[model samples]
Target chain A: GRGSEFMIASVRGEVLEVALDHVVIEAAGVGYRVNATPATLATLRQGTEARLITAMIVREDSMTLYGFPDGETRDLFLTLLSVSGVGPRLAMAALAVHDAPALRQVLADGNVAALTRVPGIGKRGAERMVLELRDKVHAVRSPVVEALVGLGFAAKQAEEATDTVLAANHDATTSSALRSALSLLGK
Target chain B: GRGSEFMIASVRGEVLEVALDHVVIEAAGVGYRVNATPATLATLRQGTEARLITAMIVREDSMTLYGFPDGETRDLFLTLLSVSGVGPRLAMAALAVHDAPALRQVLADGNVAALTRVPGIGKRGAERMVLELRDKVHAVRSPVVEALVGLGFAAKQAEEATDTVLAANHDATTSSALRSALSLLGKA
Candidate 1:
């Protein structure tokens, strides 16, 4: 049976909770297990009002919990999962290099020259990651709209088309607009 | 009244309305005006289905019609207008460089390095245009997603997140994703 609050506990019965501190709380009379990022495990403590940003991994025979202390840690965790041959455990190792934003920034900048510093990420892996995520890093709206407007649409047309496309497809990036706009215009 | 069929007539009552070699139609007995891209006007005769996409420019005293053959031409026409010191006529002249896509590619590529070659555009002007339109050109998504997913996140999450940010904000670039994701994740 599950209780009101869901949590990840360490092998020693320390429950993982809250991103701000790497602490976990274990409740009496309950048997449960959860996965957490390294930072989550480091900063959390027992019996406190804490939260562990978590992800669940389910297999046919076993279920695992993964957690992080903050959004950055969570983001890094997810990003690492995107790479080939990299699993949850490897992802945790990747996060050891830096927080989420820093890793993303490094990858986006295509600084294959820099990422080799991470423990498990070899030169080949570093190159591969940078080559992969370069164009997908800081994807906020202002830049994409500005790009569209700059291309020649009336600001209004650009804005409307962009709005329409984005609403319909969540993955549309600034770079994605050519195909998106072309499809829209064709319609 | 206009119909689907194309025809040709002249300003004078001389309606030699046989199958015209080149047809230019004068409608409503008002002044016969030609509104089109230079390229369209080049091959245009008295009357034909050579349709020109158009924009209507209105002023306090008068209304004018401008036209292009398609959306691309129309877009170039508008983009030219956005340049500093560039009026409708100058914008039209800028089109001489190439077709809409060519011009757009030039501007998008930030080829300030090359636009100085255009007749009227000076180095400074080209630079300015490049700076202004740099993001717009790159805004067209490169097939960089596969490369990005190869870096991290399941292919699905990588694609979804990238797509989500771009959709939410048209101006998002590869360099801008982390910030966008942070914002989105905060809400999540």
Candidate 2:
């Protein structure tokens, strides 16, 4: 899994179609279908320009795109994908209910009852996520901090990253902040 | 699993310790314990310095690094990890008997007899890998092409990668040439 690059991470265009869990964006004369949370789709009415943060999954038989409202949640989706028995749709379903810091709160606090509400996630799966991910960072939860770690950086590395981003670009957007931080990390 | 990025794709260091399935390499004052095929170790027994192309897998419980002699084999190891029941150790076991191209021939020609012989790959598991992987690239019998597609490139793209790797640097080692081809495909 570590040998290559596999991603089509962002797409921006006019929303030609929208559904509960899907969107077709018209970009550069091509229609790209992306799976998204129903809540995110509700914000984008047809014929409006929207930019989606995306996660691309490469399977043996297919390549799929999952969209989110911002980079924090998109980063959250990647962390969810690392859990056993979780797929893209399942990851999106979880994010539909919680943002990055919120999800980290549930994960850090071991709130299995709340986590079980996300479809396809059972009590066991929720427990597994908490068991594996709680120590990825500490108990305190910050959306920006969670965002950095969820992108696969260790906590120490992400702390330094968050410091670097906040130092020079305190007013940066979540996407721009992440871009600069990633470059700083040499990702 | 998908995440931003964490990898130990290749490592160059002094062989500090060794085992049948594991090794300890000291690089930049840090020691990396890597999983490797037994065959690769025999060649390294006399050497202090080594270059191992590696594949790193981050699981829920742990992170694993599997090493190979070169990029061709390392690339194949990545494809093996993607197979339904295959993991890093199992993939390493499979490569102990066969390199990337030979494994592809077993997969391509549907030679279950040869595939089943790989340690840890019983008859049932061997059949399953063949079942799922045969159709990823339907027409190719070369493991080299199959190895590229296994890394998530399309079959057509892998075809061109195969052609370009063969054209220039004919004397280039399989590992060296494939590294350049992957850069041509924009992965470094």
Candidate 3:
């Protein structure tokens, strides 16, 4: 009976507390507790204004928010939601256990052992994750997109560039796709 | 092998085309085709600057976007995604067939006949929709929330106020919730 509203883009606020699995953000006098991975949480500083990209899962009674340091992680977190049984918490756990590249690599290789390393992801869940997510893993969290964003390009621009280049060459790596994104951005 | 990214807040652009189930928005020279219900699309005018709140469902090969006129419809579209076997297209159909209030009424009443009027929803799907969504239907798309937003309150503020008042009285209507929201917002 519970429902969901997956993303709310991002939230900018003063950091209040970074707890074990969540961060409290004080925005407009409302304390927004954002559940996040340890990796994303580690990058935040307490008492400073932080802009954490967010995905909100709205149930009837509770509105849970998850934060990510970058679009790459957020993109990956969203990809995780497409899986049948993967919820926000389990998705966060997967990201917490492994970096974006490592997690995608695990999916690509169908490495259940590696996936099972994530808390709450059992062997069956890991196998299902690999089955459902392997082929869809290539285009997202591309270091090329990250580099493009870092190079002062908008995420939409970077993503389009990355998608265009990767469409031409699925095997393209950071060194190659990064060059293409730059070329596209320059023109 | 396909995946999704549900929402991207809102997208503003020049509307290029408003087709049967989608609209093309030209923003920064890219034509973003956003799928939308007939209800929402009817409100749009071609060749104008349109700000359609969007939900982008990303797949490996294709990234499909859905558009809505307001947060109420967008929120309902998102809630539909929570139902098992219900996808973006089906969700859009549900919204197209019913306005926010009517859709909630259907869910609240378990009106399978009304639900099956949507393009793809079968009897079983309607049953499942009611079963899963009935209880969760109350707090969303309230006229009070819409009235507050229309009255220049921030969505967050209006939503908080509405939720607070509703928590106190589950049966609160627009008249009651609207007054409570105004009171809460005007406090020192």
Candidate 4:
């Protein structure tokens, strides 16, 4: 069940083949083809050695390699993946328009206009991304936000509950906050 | 995308950790955890060097490693994956009940009872597998069967179409047979 413990965290090797959407990195005699954004791919020239923070996405019939220039971008990619209807390619599209810092600020500022720049993302999609990830700006709120989302509460709704709980007690722990929020949310 | 071209075809490493459902194999300073059936896991002992034919299954948020003892089993696993509603775990269950040769013979013989021995597979699922894969006995019929399956015709119906076409002229090429099958299936 804990498949992440076995996932490929990163890849380091020489560049062999670089296509429009994917790159073949040769490591330990195996050519690992990694999918990347245009910005990330442009940094590497053929035959240069480089390493990338990678996230492996798997389906029933296919497994693919996705790469980021830094851990911040990779973490953001994973977080964005947590949103409903957002997959790796859409996240990549979002990152393509804005890097880690820029996207974080975009979400924090609740700028749906900036988010709609991603290809294939409409206003509704951008709003949904903002609602789900905007409050995910701080790690302190992540566990509660994730739990609420998993419990069938919308991200915006969860943020409101967390705000209601946290404003009452700035010193509340995650467990207490969660208990408080679940009780409040239950009504 | 041609992901299979870049997929890990095999793995050779030292066993690092062996659990009930998966094993950790260390190769090139990297610990690769592979999931396998009980029978496959039993053959692996800790601290021993081994190699496995691995098929990597990837989802939206997960990537799983499946291993087989031989290429025959791995290829069959892949073939079974071609059927609708058959996932890696279910295919593994089928393999666990019967190995490559046995399952191949089972499909060829249309023995639904043998297939039902798989833990979660019921009578209807077994019948569907037999219908889809029974005539896939030969490589010659595979391309046609696969094409038909993709085009929305059931495997049994496609097989019947292929049989009618092939019986008319055994000398027909794959393209010709596909063309003829499409015509017959279109009318029926």
Q: What share of the true interface contacts does each candidate keep?
A: 0.00, 0.00, 0.00, 0.14
The parts of candidate 1 lying over 4 Å away from their true place are A1-32, A138-187, B1-188
Best by lDDT: 4
User: Which DockQ-derived CAPRI band holds candidate 2?
Assistant: incorrect
Against the reference, the lDDT scores of all candidates come to: 0.51, 0.68, 0.71, 0.74
Q: Which stretches of candidate 2 lie over 4 Å from their true place?
A: A1-5, A137-187, B1-188
Shift in Å, residue A32, candidate 3: 0.8
The TM-score obtained by model 1 is: 0.32
- B15-90, model 4: which lDDT tens digit per residue? 7655445676766634466766545766788899988888887666466678889887887788788777887767
**Fraction of true interface contacts that also occur in model 3:** 0.00
lDDT head-to-head 1 vs 2, winner: 2
Q: lDDT tens string, model 3, A25-92? A: 77657677888878878888899988666766655556667888865777788889888788877788
lDDT tens digits, residues B1-188, model 2?
Answer: 32223577777766765544456554543335576654576566423877788777665434456778888777777777777677665676566556567778878898898876554677898888988777642222245565666677777887787677777667666556556667888855
The best candidate in terms of DockQ:
4
Supply candidate 1's per-residue lDDT for A186.
54
Off by over 4 Å in 4: A1-6, A138-187, B1-61, B64-188
Better of 3 and 4 by lDDT: 4
Candidate 3 residues lying further than 4 Å off, grouped into runs, are: A1-7, A138-187, B1-188
Model 1 DockQ class: incorrect
